[PDB]
Amino acid sequence: GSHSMRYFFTSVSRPGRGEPRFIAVGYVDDTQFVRFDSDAASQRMEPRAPWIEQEGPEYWDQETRNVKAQSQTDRVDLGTLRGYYNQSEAGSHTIQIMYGCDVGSDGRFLRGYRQDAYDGKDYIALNEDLRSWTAADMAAQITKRKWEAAHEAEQLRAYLDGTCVEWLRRYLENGKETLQRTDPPKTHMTHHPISDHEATLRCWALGFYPAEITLTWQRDGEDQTQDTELVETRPAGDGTFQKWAAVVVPSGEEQRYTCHVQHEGLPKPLTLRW
């Protein structure tokens, strides 16, 4: 199926406590394969998946230099954006960046993306056409004019629909034993009385990969959009994911409720009833 490669960057200014903390992570689909932490001891881009370790020293020298230049670039931008928004030098602020590309099962380019944030809010983003920018406020428009004049979109596009796709294809080939598997969800239901007259029906889904999933509780055809507790999808720590959803039903009416599970590794939507 489709695949993605995405890089995530976080720069947090430490006012009067040293240079800003910089953490970078590379993903193929939902599998981390590289990382960099400014507070770690190696001060180099480090492997985090088995299939990336075969890359040679010239690969790890290049990724180390590039990830450090991204860190230095964020240092400037932390001070620059602090001036755009008329903020004091005393506060801690955050710049977050994400970019990457998607390919199909045939390896063809599907889309590229780049989005930047400041203090957890949209700052500037590249449009899907990979040619124009969208700034979130008038301060970020200053950056947009600076990047339009420098023709940053053209150079970034050459990576997003070119080099990014090239390496993603190589990674998918080098890790074809671990990156091209979809595990279907193991499902089960539990029943927990909260009193003599009401009970909590909880619908479970375990060991599914990728993380995308949908759990909905129905009651006599109608869907309980509310009256339904749904937790966020969570990692198991082994490559798979978990999620549950629960509803409080009257005791003796459990047979009128149905849970529905939708995953890509399932040939049909699973329907469960207590």
Binding site: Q62, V67, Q72, K146
Partner: peptide, 9 residues
Amino acid sequence: ALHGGWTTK
């Protein structure tokens, strides 16, 4: 692999 182009904001 990582992109190697940085224009300041």
